[PDB]
A paper describes a structure:
[name] has a leucine at position 210, whereas other known type I polyester hydrolases harbor a phenylalanine. To explore the reason for the considerably higher activity of [name], we exchanged leucine 210 in [name] with phenylalanine. As a result, the activity of the variant dropped to the level of PHL3. Residues G62, T64, S69, H130, S131, M132, W156, D177, A180, H209, N213 (catalytic triad in italic) are conserved between [name] and LCC, whereas F63 (LCC: Y95), L93 (F125), Q95 (Y127), I179 (V212) differed. Figure 2A also shows that the active site pocket of [name] is more open than that of LCC. However, the plasticity of these predominantly hydrophobic regions near the active site may contribute to binding of larger [name] substrates and be a key for a more tolerant recognition and effective processing of [name] at elevated temperatures concomitant with increased polymer chain mobility. The crystal structure of [name] shows a metal ion coordinated by the side chains of Glu148 and Asp233, the carbonyl group of Phe230 and three water molecules in a distorted octahedral geometry. We modeled this ion as sodium due to the electron density at this position and the high concentration (100 mm) of Na+ in the crystallization buffer.
Author numbering: 2 to 259
């Protein structure tokens, strides 16, 4: 049996839910308390009886605050994850810096009295929007032990991600004019190793701002990816492989089966 499985067996509805089966609470990390990042909010399951959970850090994009990605925190955490949404050291930080800050936020969790005993520090993942998504790719490229990476409308000047060894879901927005999929998201997917567990999902009709207010398609597939790779939870592969029969997705590619 897989000791990292959490929660009941999933369905389409369970991964679309605004709140999953775990009640959650939150705690604030001040900028002063944060070493190597700008502070953040940690969302965590309150139930201690089901084991420890994997950890996820999420970065906003250029000039943006944690508020622009906050909704992802409790929506993901309620599926059985400890999730920290960060502010960056400065609003002007570029993607490589954001990646180091994502790693610093993950490493902070094991020192946080509220959540340290709720996490498995060996099972960590990174996500982010725009330059924060470029940051997620950089963090994976700088730490081959990370279990998953999810750039959401990622932006980066680096297009070649051939050294990434972390299963990566690239989420593009079809109409994005800020991080256009042709030169960002799709280029990243294409240069990730051909034998990596990876997928590309383009959100039909979506703008760059799709990640900044609740989007069920973004949430459901991010949840399934984190379950499949942070928890190695094979119950979630059915949602990722093959292409979903889902009108909200305008393009899909993957290296399924994983
Ligand atoms: Na894994």
């Amino acid at each position: 049996a897989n000791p990292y499985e959490r929660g009941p067996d999933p369905t389409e509805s369970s991964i679309e839910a605004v709140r999953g089966p775990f009640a959650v609470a939150q705690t604030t990390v001040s900028r002063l308390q944060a070493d190597g990042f700008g502070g953040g909010t940690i969302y965590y399951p309150t139930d201690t009886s089901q084991g420890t959970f994997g950890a996820v850090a999420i970065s906003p994009g250029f000039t943006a605050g944690q508020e622009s990605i906050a909704w992802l925190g409790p929506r993901i955490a309620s599926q059985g994850f400890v999730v920290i949404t960060i502010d960056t050291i400065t609003r002007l930080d570029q993607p490589d810096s954001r990646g180091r800050q994502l790693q610093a936020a993950l490493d902070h969790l094991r020192t946080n009295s509220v959540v340290r005993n709720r996490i498995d520090p060996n099972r960590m993942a990174v996500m982010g929007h725009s330059m924060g998504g470029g940051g997620a790719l950089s963090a994976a490229a700088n730490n081959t032990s990370l279990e998953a990476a999810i750039p959401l409308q990622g932006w980066h000047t680096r297009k070649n991600w051939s050294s990434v060894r972390t299963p990566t879901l690239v989420v593009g927005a079809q109409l994005d004019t800020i991080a256009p999929v042709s030169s960002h998201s799709e280029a990243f997917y294409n240069s990730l190793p051909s034998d990596l567990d990876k997928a590309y999902m383009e959100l039909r009709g979506a703008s760059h701002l799709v990640s900044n207010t609740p989007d069920t398609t973004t949430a459901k597939y991010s949840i399934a990816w984190l379950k499949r790779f942070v928890d190695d939870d094979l119950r979630y592969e059915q949602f990722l492989c093959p292409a979903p029969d889902d009108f909200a997705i305008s393009e899909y590619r993957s290296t399924c089966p994983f």
